[PDB]
Design a binder for this molecule. Structure first.
Ligand code: CA
Length: 130
């Protein structure tokens, strides 16, 4: 089973990448199963702003690694990130500020939940889907 673990915000970087103190070591995390636009792309600043606000304003930030590979090729931790028990990955997709990403190395536990969010944001023609 997956477990949520505590972490502390160091700096929000963009829509899908965030730097956290995890077990007393600073690490860059990349959100599983979502792709936000890059800052210089349409909805990029909006996605960055969204993730920044959610993590900065949360009382408690948690990381939940999945069952597949835990780091990407660029050294980033691959997790679901929660702020006060709300998943940032899902919130971005349901807001139409990220699309669901390909599965990477077995990390698929929340794929269906995120696809459901995405279908609803698309039906609502929200943001990226506008
Ligand atoms: Ca991206």
């Amino acid at each position: 089973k997956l477990h949520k673990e505590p972490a502390t915000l160091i700096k929000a970087i963009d829509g899908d990448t965030v730097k956290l103190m995890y077990k007393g070591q600073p690490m860059t995390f990349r959100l599983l199963l979502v792709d936000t636009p890059e800052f210089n792309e349409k909805y990029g600043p909006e996605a960055s702003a969204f993730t920044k606000k959610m993590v900065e304003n949360g009382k408690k930030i948690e990381v939940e690694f999945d069952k597949g590979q835990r780091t990407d090729k660029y050294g980033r931790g691959l997790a679901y990130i929660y702020a006060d028990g709300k998943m940032v990955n899902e919130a971005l997709v349901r807001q139409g500020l990220a699309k669901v990403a390909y599965v990477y190395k077995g990390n698929n536990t929340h794929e269906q939940l995120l696809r459901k969010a995405e279908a609803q944001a698309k039906k609502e023609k929200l943001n990226i889907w506008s």
